[PDB]
Design brief:
Chain A: This is Tyrosine-protein kinase Lck. The complex is a heterodimer. Chain A is α+β, with helices and mostly antiparallel strands. Chain A has two helices and four strands; from the N terminus they run αββββα. In chain A, a hairpin with a 3-residue loop joins strand 2 (about 40-50) and strand 3. Chain A starts with 10 loop residues before the first helix and ends in a 16-residue tail after the last helix. Chain B has a six-stranded mixed beta sheet. The relative contact order of chain B is 0.23. The chains are: A alpha+beta, B alpha+beta.
Chain lengths: ~100, ~100
């Protein structure tokens, strides 16, 4: 039910995908960790200097009550709330989440 | 001392890491030799595979006994430079044409 969720994607694949045409900085995705079902990671397209398109990755960590967080400073009931929060504020992220990875 | 496009101690894996790092665009490239077989070269070029996304294609550079190289049996060159020259100017069957060497 979410356009930015991929799951059966690898770190290297998140980038092959994210760095590909149709994506811009702010482009992002959340995926299922292959060795830890139920734990997730957020990957986002970022562009830096004397370099350019760079894909940044953040571990979404699981709470003991269900829930997630990248930064202990704020938690979210679900991935949905995490994505709503980050699109509306970078809040420690290389940048604000813009559109989902183009498939 | 090799040319800017040629990388000395480079594996396929490390070659890939180089090209996928920031700075490189499609057509960005490098030629490298085989770590376990002397005189065998390969071309690695940053590009994009529909149904995969951004990838590094690897082309096998074959040898003409007694002088010469070729990736395609339809086109041979007397030197590796003429190979890199041709492909910079004419994609000629590769993903696209070689542009700038892999910046590290």
């Amino acid at each position: 039910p979410e356009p930015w969720f991929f799951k059966n994607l690898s770190r290297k694949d998140a980038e092959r995908q994210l760095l590909a045409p149709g994506n811009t900085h702010g482009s992002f995705l959340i995926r299922e960790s292959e060795s830890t079902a139920g734990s997730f990671s957020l990957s986002v397209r970022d562009f830096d200097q004397n370099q350019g398109e760079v894909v940044k990755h953040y571990k979404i960590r699981n709470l003991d009550n269900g829930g997630f967080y990248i930064s202990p400073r704020i938690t979210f009931p679900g991935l949905h709330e995490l994505v709503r929060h980050y699109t509306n504020a970078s809040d420690g992220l290389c940048t604000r989440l813009s559109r989902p990875c183009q498939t």
